[PDB]
């Protein structure tokens, strides 16, 4: 799996952290403005967001799946970019 | 759209797609931020065979603050108060952005099974359930037909 437990979406820009926890560069940045120093999912202390998960970016070149929405078949890695560009995504919000 | 909009749509596409089983929650009408929850009472609990109603209320931050829940269905329970306030760590300190309305509502079944008289918010309940289980049981089963049945 793939996903980035705090937007529930597909990871983009992934960050593994000191507790070996994977998030969105954007969604682990965000959650310590609001709990700053604090793991969002396992509460653990973080001195900071953590370091590029390339490991994780790498096999989700690799990796496929069709829109939530659309139902086009994406690269994980594109799939970020997909879901802003896709008019079904764009129409619900 | 917010993230918090996006966030609670995806919680709602997951909950139809693998239903919870003790556990209905959807938006009141075209308010995606506020939500009605049904959850049954536990088994082998008094409260079993009673439908508790709870309110949820998505803060503009979700998920990086708690939704503020309360039960609308009265309760006797030491955590769970009669304005229908429920004192729960997660939602409140213990709060974390990778929770789910359905993690939350899986803690509260779970406090239903396993109250916490220690940290109370109805100190008279909080008493009788660590002295006397049997009256607590006694009285929440009659609070359970009269209310959530
Ligand atoms: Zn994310
Ligand atoms: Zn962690
Ligand atoms: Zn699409």
């Keep these: 799996s793939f996903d980035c437990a705090v937007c529930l979406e597909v990871l983009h820009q992934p960050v593994r952290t000191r507790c070996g926890h994977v998030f969105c560069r954007s969604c682990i940045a965000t959650s310590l403005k609001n709990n700053k120093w604090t793991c969002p999912y396992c509460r653990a202390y973080l001195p900071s967001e953590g370091v590029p998960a390339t490991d994780v970016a790498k096999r989700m070149k690799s990796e496929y799946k069709n829109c939530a929405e659309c139902d086009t078949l994406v690269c994980l890695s594109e799939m970020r970019a997909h879901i802003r560009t896709c008019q079904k995504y764009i129409d619900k919000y | ?149």
């Design chain 2, 1 to 149: 759209g917010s993230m918090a909009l996006k966030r609670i749509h995806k919680e709602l596409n997951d909950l139809a797609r693998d239903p919870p089983a003790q556990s209905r929650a959807g938006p009141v009408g075209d308010d995606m931020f506020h939500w009605q929850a049904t959850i049954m009472g536990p088994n082998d609990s008094p409260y079993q065979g009673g439908v508790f109603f709870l309110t949820i209320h998505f803060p503009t931050d979700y998920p990086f603050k708690p939704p503020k829940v309360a039960f609308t269905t009265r309760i006797y329970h030491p955590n769970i108060n009669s304005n229908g306030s429920i004192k729960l760590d997660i939602l409140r300190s213990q709060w974390s952005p990778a929770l789910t309305i359905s993690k939350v509502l899986l803690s509260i079944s779970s406090l239903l099974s396993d109250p916490n008289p220690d940290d109370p918010l109805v100190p008279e309940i909080a008493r009788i359930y660590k002295t006397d289980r049997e009256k607590y049981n006694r009285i929440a089963r009659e609070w359970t037909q009269k209310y959530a049945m």
